[PDB]
Ligand binder design. Structure first.
Ligand SMILES: Nc1ncnc2c1ncn2[C@@H]1O[C@H](COP(=O)(O)OP(=O)(O)O[C@H]2O[C@H](CO)[C@@H](O)[C@H](O)[C@H]2O)[C@@H](O)[C@H]1O
Ligand SMILES: Nc1ncnc2c1ncn2[C@@H]1O[C@H](COP(=O)(O)OP(=O)(O)O[C@H]2O[C@H](CO)[C@@H](O)[C@H](O)[C@H]2O)[C@@H](O)[C@H]1O
Ligand SMILES: [Cl-]
Ligand SMILES: [Cl-]
Ligand SMILES: [Zn+2]
Ligand SMILES: [Zn+2]
Ligand SMILES: [Zn+2]
Ligand SMILES: [Zn+2]
Lengths: 313, 308
């Protein structure tokens, strides 16, 4: 098909769609420290679920090799000290269980644990943005094969958030509308649950990228409630299981995109959180490193069609 | 001990964190001489119209953007030029093995192609880049680089214009004119200086920066082409020795084709070299903020001491 450039407020950048790219030739542990019974081999615990239960289903712990130091906080008040929080979420007691294998309720409990930790961190005025994310598979950057995700509290609003705030503001000012409240008309619907919808994003950065989006206008992920957590957990699991089947269990990353902690009232109407899932299908080269512009070999129209047709029976 | 650093050129914070490097882990061809019929249409060669060619610039067979959608121009048509620069008649030679003169010819080719392209009002920015090695993204094992001409100025060019502008407004200075006092000098030639950038995105990243204030790469002349050739050869060879011949990417950062007069005083082209040492995860995809396990102070001391 013919190449196209697409833009979206959320990314606030163009992406190249070009399927002819896919047609080019080319010349080229049963336990771990995260496993139950081995807690003393981990950096300190923040909490577990159930609370203080020796028979835990998840734990939220400090990252033992953290990118940022929680002990540089008061100094945090072209260079700034490397203060922040880096935590790990152990999603299973069993090494061989993956996130998508967990049932909706349990996935919901992991989501509520994200929520609890965000709320702890947000008591610090030094923190401006909290990034939750998950790596599964070596080529998606994973170093622990055990099923886990991570949280990184930042003293600064990072560039995707600045970009999204600018793009979503411009769209609100031109149309009066939150672009994500209009996800069903602006993007390609795959599946829908009671409170969330998953779409293939119109101006998708990566092939088979998927966004899961609250249908209600909701600025902060941390505003998630128990009922919405189980509903999101089922939709997240479905999207992961449909990805696993259709694309032959590739590695993936997922990333919650949420509100800055100090979001202003005037930002609220066009600030709407979402969950981004990127199956790891290939790397980038010099074009992308040079420009910050990506090349996508699959149109989201085709992703949605295919992903709608996926049968998990 | 971890730290955040910013630079007007990236216009973004990067996180330096050396502890991160301690964590454990559980884990012939169609471009060769005479096979030109197996290639997309030639744009030119060097020497010009010589059957005994040294380099060729040709159309990309599987283009990201179509050179045939020009009149047609949340959506725009996928118009642009996607060109391949074949760097050798021979398959086993890699760019860094070429002599400074021959590397300069490649750099002069880039400039000639740039200037062909700048005759198109439809075009706003041209990205010259190279991939060497499968993990840096290569599909053709033959030595080659690429040119992507875009109808719009892309995110890093916008960030750079913004960040270099703010710095110029704050200081009256062009920040890359201050390279020797802002970054960590590794090597220097008659007209270029190579550095480990202060707020480098990637471990072992190196910039090659004209010492004269020069907004466009394509203003390169024959003398500077050879001078740059040798400094680029030198950095590529130092990387291969120090770092056990890793894959790499390099990227020319240059000015938009329609750069305004008032943007000139703070607009300064440079060549970025990124040895391919690590991948990203969800933090970088989520935020667009990177994590760099090696301070540029440390890269520069190591690279100064490499002997070939
Ligand atoms: N005993 C222990 N107790 C507590 N924590 C322990 C531990 N042993 C190991 N850890 C931590 O566990 C984490 C596991 O994380 P992942 O496997 O998701 O990817 P990682 O963060 O290594 O790297 C990927 O994700 C990061 C974040 O995006 C990228 O920067 C990087 O390039 C990519 O490879 C590591 O951060 C590690 O420090
Ligand atoms: N017979 C022929 N005639 C003309 N051209 C031919 C040809 N046969 C192959 N080609 C082209 O030659 C190029 C070889 O380029 P590279 O090895 O630098 O990486 P490639 O562009 O494949 O992908 C890497 O670079 C891009 C851009 O940075 C990333 O998007 C991508 O993920 C990464 O793998 C390809 O672009 C291909 O289209
Ligand atoms: Cl939140
Ligand atoms: Cl140029
Ligand atoms: Zn384990
Ligand atoms: Zn909304
Ligand atoms: Zn060859
Ligand atoms: Zn300058």
């Amino acid at each position: 098909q013919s190449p196209e450039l697409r833009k979206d407020p959320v990314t606030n950048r163009w992406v190249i769609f070009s399927p002819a790219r896919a047609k080019r030739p080319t010349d080229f542990p049963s336990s771990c420290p995260f496993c139950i019974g081995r807690e003393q081999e981990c950096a300190p615990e923040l909490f577990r679920v159930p609370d203080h239960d020796p028979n835990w289903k998840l734990r939220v712990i400090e990252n033992l090799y953290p990118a940022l130091s929680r002990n540089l906080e008061t100094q945090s008040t072209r260079t700034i000290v490397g203060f922040g929080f880096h935590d790990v979420v152990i999603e299973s007691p069993v090494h061989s269980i993956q996130l998508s294998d967990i049932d909706p309720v349990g996935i919901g409990d992991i989501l509520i644990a994200y929520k609890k930790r965000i709320n702890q961190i947000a008591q610090h005025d030094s923190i401006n943005y909290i990034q939750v994310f998950k790596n599964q598979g070596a080529s998606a950057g994973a170093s622990m094969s055990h099923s886990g995700s991570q949280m990184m509290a930042l003293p600064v609003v990072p560039p995707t958030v600045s970009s999204r705030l600018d793009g979503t503001k411009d769209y609100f000012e031109e149309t009066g509308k939150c672009c994500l409240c209009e996800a069903k008309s602006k993007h390609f619907v795959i599946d829908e649950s009671s409170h969330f919808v998953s779409v293939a994003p119109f101006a998708a950065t990566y092939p088979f990228e998927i966004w899961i989006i609250p249908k209600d206008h909701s600025s902060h992920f941390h505003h998630l409630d128990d009922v919405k957590a189980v509903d999101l957990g089922g939709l997240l699991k479905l999207m992961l299981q449909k990805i696993a089947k259709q694309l032959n269990d590739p590695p993936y990353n997922y990333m919650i995109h949420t509100s800055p902690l100090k979001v202003t009232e005037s930002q609220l109407p066009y600030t709407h959180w979402f969950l981004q899932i990127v199956p790891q299908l290939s790397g980038v080269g010099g074009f992308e490193i040079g420009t910050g512009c990506y090349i996508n070999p699959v149109f989201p129209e085709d992703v949605a069609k295919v992903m709608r047709e996926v049968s998990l029976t």
